[PDB]
Design an enzyme around this catalytic site. Structure first.
Site, PDB file in Angstrom:
ATOM      1  CD1 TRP B 127      -2.882   1.262   0.405  1.00 41.01           C
ATOM      2  CD2 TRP B 127      -2.315   1.747   2.519  1.00 41.01           C
ATOM      3  NE1 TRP B 127      -3.793   2.171   0.889  1.00 41.01           N
ATOM      4  CE2 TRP B 127      -3.469   2.487   2.179  1.00 41.01           C
ATOM      5  CE3 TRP B 127      -1.772   1.888   3.802  1.00 41.01           C
ATOM      6  CZ2 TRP B 127      -4.089   3.359   3.078  1.00 41.01           C
ATOM      7  CZ3 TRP B 127      -2.388   2.754   4.694  1.00 41.01           C
ATOM      8  CH2 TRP B 127      -3.538   3.479   4.326  1.00 41.01           C
ATOM      9  CG  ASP B 208      -2.000  -2.717   7.163  1.00 35.72           C
ATOM     10  OD1 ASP B 208      -3.195  -2.751   7.525  1.00 35.72           O
ATOM     11  OD2 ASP B 208      -1.552  -1.791   6.463  1.00 35.72           O
ATOM     12  CB  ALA B 210      -6.843  -2.822   6.461  1.00 37.09           C
ATOM     13  CE  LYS B 243      -9.877   0.002   3.450  1.00 36.97           C
ATOM     14  NZ  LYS B 243      -8.468  -0.261   3.709  1.00 36.97           N
TER      15      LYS B 243
HETATM   16  C1  LIG Z   1      -7.584   0.670   4.188  1.00 34.02           C
HETATM   17  C2  LIG Z   1      -6.299   0.247   4.507  1.00 34.02           C
HETATM   18  C3  LIG Z   1      -5.664   0.682   5.676  1.00 34.02           C
HETATM   19  C4  LIG Z   1      -6.279   1.688   6.668  1.00 34.02           C
HETATM   20  O1  LIG Z   1      -7.557   2.270   6.565  1.00 34.02           O
HETATM   21  P1  LIG Z   1      -7.985   3.441   7.529  1.00 34.02           P
HETATM   22  O2  LIG Z   1      -8.964   4.109   6.532  1.00 34.02           O
HETATM   23  O3  LIG Z   1      -6.888   4.347   7.887  1.00 34.02           O
HETATM   24  O4  LIG Z   1      -8.792   2.876   8.603  1.00 34.02           O
HETATM   25  C5  LIG Z   1      -4.419   0.220   5.968  1.00 34.02           C
HETATM   26  N1  LIG Z   1      -3.795  -0.652   5.147  1.00 34.02           N
HETATM   27  C6  LIG Z   1      -4.370  -1.093   4.009  1.00 34.02           C
HETATM   28  C7  LIG Z   1      -3.627  -2.083   3.122  1.00 34.02           C
HETATM   29  C8  LIG Z   1      -5.612  -0.665   3.670  1.00 34.02           C
HETATM   30  O5  LIG Z   1      -6.156  -1.140   2.498  1.00 34.02           O
END
Ligand SMILES: *Cc1c(COP(=O)(O)O)cnc(C)c1O
Ligand SMILES: *Cc1c(COP(=O)(O)O)cnc(C)c1O
Ligand SMILES: Cc1ccc(CCC(=O)O)cc1
EC number: 2.6.1.57
Lengths: 388, 394
Positions: B127, B208, B210, B243
């Site tokens: 990311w 991470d 998410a 999400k």
């Molecule tokens: C969405 C996402 C996040 C963090 O989302 P926040 O909107 O800050 O809650 C972190 N890492 C990845 C890979 C994501 O897709």
């Protein structure tokens, strides 16, 4: 690895609440007659309507919503809001705004120093320390008269120079309650422009001093005189949405060019810290502010609050007066805001809480909103008995 | 003074939408979206979420300052959601944060406090926002192989070879599941091997998490994370509720510090509360309260898991259809990875040149690295994307 973490220092004000016929006069939150921190009528009505109109919770704006940005700008600067030279950044409360302000300034000037009032909000110093920014203090509170040592303040401020930053409390000085007059503000403005020091204004209690417009007067004075100003506002207290974490950083610039620069830098600051700023609280604020009916009830409620507190300061002052035949404690009625530094020594402060049971910050800071008709005489009795 | 400010580059996202919106093409498609969108192109508010908000409006009596590190009910519910029965509270430090990004930022800050000479290893690719935060902090960033452009799967031998170079004290960032942007993920057996490499090197794993719930299921998606938590004594987990709860804008995240002992947990917890305090004092309450309400209320949690599952299955069916359409058209199974990938994103392996040909010739927009959002596909768009990919010679 994590075992290398050194033990950190806790927050004084918050520590009290933990160490708590008990009488709480610590944390700076508004409390009503029944010791409760209510949700403002308009705020409740706003959330109610929001729950019915919002269809999605997708990602919104990186610098906050235009509606919030415009409403906040107008609330603070009134007609002095020059959109062409103003950058706005929605933040996580006023503290988030202060931090972001410091980050922005340091980017602009790696060698910046910060002047803070003697005394000032503890959290101001901790953050600067954490960031590693050199902190200098300017005389402010006059220990004897409990007023403002304006003579000393001007002298110290004259020593500031280009690139340095001066932190001022727009109104309701935390923790003293001692505040500058418009005449004093004009003189400060002349000092600022002569030195070229960037002013950072902490606007946390707009509405708790003398009124919504009147409390923004000094800020508006500085804004009309100094070409570049930073204002960190909080909606925590005046809107009663503390836990929502909503505030905004206003960057007043000289030209549109610098404005686009700052706006870009600010949006970047949010992105690199937590992506998007929280939406809920900011939405409540803009809703109240852009809905005539809602703004009216909010203005009224805030007015009732500020009026009640003023009555309490006068009541307490009187109680003490009759308990000593001397109006030494008259300064209490002169102070404006939610706090007042009593001037009791550290030893007395502790003695009072340990035997009398009334909890006030170590520097004799009392939250006026914490008192009431039946607890006032008791407080007065306590201070009187303890007075060395 | 502010004139000195060095111009900062925009979010790019804006530019993407700028291109698309300017396109006068009747049938233009947008697979560059980074959020979930249902059949009608909307990012709805989940039923359980709207229910929790109604309930909160009626039960909340005050909005005074709550917890500096977050609320107990939220910290516990999140810990149990991610670590299940394997949650050892005695050694687990938790911090409510401003979304998952805030959780990452705090994790990096905490680690730097504990070890100044910290170096972070990130996957190739990762990311983008990860690197940005690190570059901003000025932390040494090292890459480890991951996406195999030829097979669209994980270049595991490369990942291991590169990770072997990690020193004691370095941080290795792993996506718990649904790799963004690739869509290529590790199997539980590969996680096991990674765990060994982590033990050997003594590198601290930062996970991470998410997309828990978008891969194979809630528990299933936490499998790799739970394995790491069992084998390694110190683990940092950055969780996001944006999400899987559909509360993107509320900014709800969580930082879990798994420690080797209670004494170390106290230090981590204190340093975390301190970190929240020095950034914005208190974390956002609304979204966290929605989460803890949905999770602690049987009826709600049930409806939530049900809705998430339907979304997950819907996307899986989408992937299958696309893979199928591509199989019929290509006369081969080269694109089979489309059905093997998990999560809402998938990098197709098309070069920037091919990405441009796709947009210009077919009006289909996607991120420049050929990352597409599966949720943006549907029965009408699938045949088009399939045709496009093949016609551009991908
Ligand atoms: C969405 C996402 C996040 C963090 O989302 P926040 O909107 O800050 O809650 C972190 N890492 C990845 C890979 C994501 O897709
Ligand atoms: C309340 C207050 C703030 C901001 O508090 P937030 O809860 O972060 O909105 C900032 N400065 C002072 C002096 C305050 O009293
Ligand atoms: C960290 C923090 C402490 C206190 C406050 C309330 C304002 C005060 O008590 O000075 C907010 C935040």
């Amino acid at each position: 690895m994590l075992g290398n973490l050194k033990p950190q220092a806790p927050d004084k004000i918050l520590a009290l609440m933990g160490e708590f016929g008990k009488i709480d006069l610590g944390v700076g939150v508004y409390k009503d007659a029944t010791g409760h921190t209510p949700i403002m009528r308009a705020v409740h009505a706003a959330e109610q309507r929001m729950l019915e109109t919002e269809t999605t919770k997708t990602y919104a704006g990186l610098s906050g919503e235009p509606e919030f940005q415009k409403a906040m700008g107008e609330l603070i600067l009134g007609d002095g809001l020059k959109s062409e030279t103003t950058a706005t950044l929605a933040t996580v409360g006023g503290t988030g705004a202060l931090r972001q302000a410091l980050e922005l300034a340091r980017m602009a000037n790696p060698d910046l120093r910060v002047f803070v009032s003697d005394p000032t909000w503890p959290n101001h110093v901790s953050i600067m320390n954490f960031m590693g920014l050199p902190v200098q203090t300017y005389r402010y509170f006059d220990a004897e008269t409990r007023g403002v040592d304006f003579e000393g303040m001007k002298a110290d401020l004259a020593a500031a120079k280009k690139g340095d930053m001066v932190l001022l409390h727009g109104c309701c000085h935390n923790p003293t309650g001692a505040n500058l007059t418009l005449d004093q503000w004009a003189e400060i403005a002349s000092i600022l422009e002569k030195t070229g020091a960037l002013p950072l204004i902490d606007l946390a209690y707009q509405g708790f001093g003398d009124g919504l417009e009147e409390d923004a007067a000094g800020t508006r004075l500085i804004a009309s005189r100094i070409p570049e100003v930073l204002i960190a506002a909080s909606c925590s207290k005046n809107f009663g949405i503390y836990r929502e974490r909503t505030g905004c950083l206003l960057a007043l610039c000289a030209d549109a060019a610098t404005r686009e620069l700052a706006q870009g830098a600010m949006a970047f600051l949010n992105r690199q810290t937590y992506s998007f700023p929280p939406f809920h609280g900011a939405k409540i604020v803009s809703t109240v502010l852009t809905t005539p009916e809602l703004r009216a009830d909010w203005m009224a409620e805030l007015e009732a609050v500020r009026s009640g507190m003023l009555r309490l300061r006068e009541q307490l002052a009187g109680e003490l007066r009759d308990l000593s035949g001397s109006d030494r404690f008259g300064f209490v009625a002169e102070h404006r805001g939610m706090f007042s530094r009593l001037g009791a020594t550290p030893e007395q402060v502790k003695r009072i809480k340990e035997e009398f049971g009334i909890y006030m910050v170590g520097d004799s800071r009392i939250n006026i909103a914490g008192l009431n008709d039946n607890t006032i005489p008791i407080l007065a009795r306590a201070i009187i008995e303890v007075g060395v």
